[PDB]
Amino acid sequence: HMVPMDKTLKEFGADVQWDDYAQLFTLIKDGAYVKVKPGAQTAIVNGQPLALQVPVVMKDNKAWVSDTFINDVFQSGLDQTFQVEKRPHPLNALTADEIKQAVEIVKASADFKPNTRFTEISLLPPDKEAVWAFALENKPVDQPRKADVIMLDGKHIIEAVVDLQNNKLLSWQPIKDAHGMVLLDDFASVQNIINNSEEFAAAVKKRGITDAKKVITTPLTVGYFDGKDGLKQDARLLKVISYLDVGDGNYWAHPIENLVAVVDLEQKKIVKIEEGPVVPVPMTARPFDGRDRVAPAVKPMQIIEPEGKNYTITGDMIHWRNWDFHLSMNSRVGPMISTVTYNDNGTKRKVMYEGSLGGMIVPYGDPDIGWYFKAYLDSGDYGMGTLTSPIARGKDAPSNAVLLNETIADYTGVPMEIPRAIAVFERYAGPEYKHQEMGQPNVSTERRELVVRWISTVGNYDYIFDWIFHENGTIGIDAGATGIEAVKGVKAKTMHDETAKDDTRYGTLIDHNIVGTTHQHIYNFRLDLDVDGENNSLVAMDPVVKPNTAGGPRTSTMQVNQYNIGNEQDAAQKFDPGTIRLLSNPNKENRMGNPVSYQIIPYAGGTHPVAKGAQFAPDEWIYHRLSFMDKQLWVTRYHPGERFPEGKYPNRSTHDTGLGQYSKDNESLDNTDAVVWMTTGTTHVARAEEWPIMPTEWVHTLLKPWNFFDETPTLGALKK
């Protein structure tokens, strides 16, 4: 007995092409490329024949398949993209069971309270060295699996550790002063409290709003202002910004400007209602979903790899040409790329022990009541792994991508499987190199890049991250920003209205009554690079114009200043893209006697204006609290507990406990295990082109092998 091919396969998630002339189906899904003919005894999977007991049936222009077709074909094994792991890698994430076990163990302390929530539950990372010894030497790591369990007990943070090998609780530790991040149920609470507010309904009615049920709230954190905002330092507070729902699916386009509510999550009450001038809510419909648009014709374009992929995913290990690395997922920072090696003619050479997003911030520049505190720390305050956006197959990533699911703990400590959470795809990136000697045959090779892509969405913005592995050893990291703008409601319809000048002082007027408030997007990446080992030094090479001292007619020459950067404080610096910064290994040279190095480029371009530093006066708290914002390059001594640019508990923090703290003591960076931090940002002055939805804007960073090799890396196997 059977079932409709077309519909089952759509559920399952495969693309389905019918070719009437060839009488042939082409089915695609991840590493599987399938061709089958109605009534044929065999199908084709990645070039390999597969026997069907029950062939595909055409019945009045309708295709029908056996109820096991989908397993028989895709589960077949002829799609070799995924292989199962012999020995579980030591950096594999907590599995659902492990998550479930950690939650039971802490629930069995006498201190657990049922209102408790989990801010993060994550592998406590074994020690770098055993991990490397596992990757390179296969030495089993013999210290036992532990998980970090970070709980929010009302407003207090407790950090618990559990040992899962032995099912026991190793530590339980309240963290004084620390506030927890925003959690999912906070969103509901806030909407709820506003809903139950007689007072709030009144503030709202007198700003033109007749149906309060129509008000969409959104929770922001309050930052820290040494009291100027009038808020007690030791309460769990969030500010609530409001929109009117008009039925166009875009409440973001209907700001109720100049109304703020401060909510005490513990009490579950609005403890304050800041109120300013009444600005009429912008009411014109502004859907971004296409509802009011003509869908034009597009000729199809497909990228296909009909014999399967060049990469192999074994458990979480990915192998691709000379690259090997381990890919996993954290609830706070998303993807983590670990134990990365480059296979040099047989021997795997170390490149990066662990790279991931460090943290990010999007701080605005308008002083008015609904804005002066607006600064999202997306990962740290909202948990970016958790808010991963499933990839939209074929659109969010190219049609030849393979899409992975990933499993993290949610806030109540139940596992959640994120479908299509990270995309992996190879892409053609132009010619790897070329020379066309005059009169001679041409020489050209293709360039191929392996991209790992992850998208996370926080309130209005959507961020995309690409980790790009060039065959020739380069590694790129790019962040793209898209979504909907945080807009300010204003009286001016055009720049000709009386108030336009005042309305547009902190942002562009991007639609009638709507201003795109200026702000920055500052990303930072924590790269624990071990260039061919962990003992590294940071080197500077500054191209300079020196006077010619060798005679002949030139007055000047191009020369370099090479010097070492001996310690943390000197390493925290602006990046001038005119200069070269290497992380060299001073114990290891290439065939020419040069320290094998990677070149570190925090700014390799972008589509928005670039952020030169924090767009804040040096006396702003946000400035005081987050130094990572103002240097492009930082290097610190390896420290397992040092992970976040913004610091570990940044909600309403009062000092810098991130990169400022990590480099406070100004330690030696000479010939020692370093961690690199790249900060890169844009400064976003808006324009109509970005409204009601912003075209994706991109920044790029780059890491390039610098005399890490002896020659053109992609020349090929030597046959002599």
Next chain:
Amino acid sequence: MVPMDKTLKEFGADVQWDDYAQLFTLIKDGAYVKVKPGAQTAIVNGQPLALQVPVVMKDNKAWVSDTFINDVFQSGLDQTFQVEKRPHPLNALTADEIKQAVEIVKASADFKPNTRFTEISLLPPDKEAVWAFALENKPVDQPRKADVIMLDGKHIIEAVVDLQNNKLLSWQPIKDAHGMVLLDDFASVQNIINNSEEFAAAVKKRGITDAKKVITTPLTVGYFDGKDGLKQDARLLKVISYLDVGDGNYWAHPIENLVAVVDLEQKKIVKIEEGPVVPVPMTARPFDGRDRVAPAVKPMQIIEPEGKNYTITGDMIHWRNWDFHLSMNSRVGPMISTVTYNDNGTKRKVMYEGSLGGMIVPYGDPDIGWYFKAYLDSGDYGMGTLTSPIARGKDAPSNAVLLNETIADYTGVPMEIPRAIAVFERYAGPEYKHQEMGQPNVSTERRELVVRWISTVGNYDYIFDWIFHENGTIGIDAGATGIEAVKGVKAKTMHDETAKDDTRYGTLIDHNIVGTTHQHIYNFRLDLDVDGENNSLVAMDPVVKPNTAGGPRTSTMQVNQYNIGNEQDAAQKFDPGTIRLLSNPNKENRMGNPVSYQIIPYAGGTHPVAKGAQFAPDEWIYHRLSFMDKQLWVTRYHPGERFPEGKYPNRSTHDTGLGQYSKDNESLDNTDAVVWMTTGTTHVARAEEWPIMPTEWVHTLLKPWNFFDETPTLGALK
């Protein structure tokens, strides 16, 4: 009948047989063909075709009718290309016009016997007439004319010919100009060297046993007000030499400190400069794979089975909301013209003409073989002429369409460059996305249309991409690859004694081989008519100001806005932190903002960036070529001002380029402007780039700025 594989392949098509489906798939440029043995029909870009003669399987190989290729591919079901019934006025000189123009000047009595041709080009009709053609379809009422530039021995002469009336309109000798380097100069240089006792002798010194294995390379000598000891009115080239050792890579075998100066009119060496003998590096370093085995890769194809979304009509290209015209020039290569954006039914002007303006690759080493070294690749060598045919599938994706283009060689004969330019669409990530919490997703694909051109001059190969975004943005990227100019040195590793002196001016990248430091400086000439030609240049500098409106913030994010009124102020360093707009102060979007385009001379690069010329302001090259040391320029539209480095930059004594064009500091207020973007890299070498350099890219960008009233990709309203 004729054999299917041999015919299709001679034709340039890609043949795939699929035994499972018993199906052939044939691909070439815009045609995607599906045909089965014995079928009465085929599919061409999704559409059915009756076959005169079915395809026959005769012994596991296939036969087709002798007409098949034409029947099928030129059937009209592949619509990539349509006929141009009314020729765009900027259409390049055809082969016939080239021959006609050569005859006309060959018929003057002033035409001297061995005269050569530096450049034979359309003399474009005037701007307004051409816009009128493209927008209103007005016939341009002007005979087709050509600029004919001649090199008589060493003398430059500009002629203009009227091709319609077949008459010579003018014949101007050009006082003091030197001609660019022409093909046949390469061989003279080589012969002249081969026949020089003196040189054969200088070479034997340096340890070379057979002088017929010595490969010459011709360089322009610059200008040093006599310090180089070279007389000004003589036609000269300096020769650097290498030793051919059979590895196919003479560049890897320099003869250091040996320079010859050749006078091309006398045909002889007029000076040999000789410095310390450095043994020639000998090790075979081929780069063509002769000694390598690529590893086996699974196939990847990018397919457009229903044909392309663009349409090429003669040289006009239509694609989504873009329309524009693509022609080819022997000097600067491709030119993009009469570019408009169809805004909901109305074509709005964006760029009249954009093209490479000029480039330069200047070196940082004072020694005898280098101090003068500086390739002005287009202006001194002719980058169009030296176009490198695109290698299908490799230099461009497997879904490109490859164009042929015609120009005149230095003897005046037409020359068809096969696959001179690639046109291709590509997925470029999501165009926009919002995943609202708890809601259905919204995503659209970004597509870009790319125009790719590759030129190779001596050892560099350069790639240019003109990239049209659906959303109205235009990127322009320049890629650099090929083989480094290296210096022979005694040092083998950084441990040897000479190593430090040896690397004062570059990295030791192989034994005895140093990659001399230099820069790559590209300049793009962009006549933009933002929604019309009457424009002004506007600065917007984001700044941090004190909060005045109250509350806890001490500071705010504000913008300094102001007009840049005149050419000298427009001539400026670019701060990627600031914004620069070419605005149309006469037209505004729905919000009352002037429609504009944001200009981004530096949107990134994979090599370190040059923020200016790496030359003391008193170096002659710095003086001759101002364009190197500012990233943005804007000048008043003038039809004769096209080259940032000047019309005749060979051995020039002043700046006839952008230095001269802004010499008089004219007004840029509400008038026709021409934007010039300079971007460049500072190249410090590494071993990863030897013997062949992985392509490195720089990026620039032109973005609509309040040109539209909203997200331009949303689609039309119902």
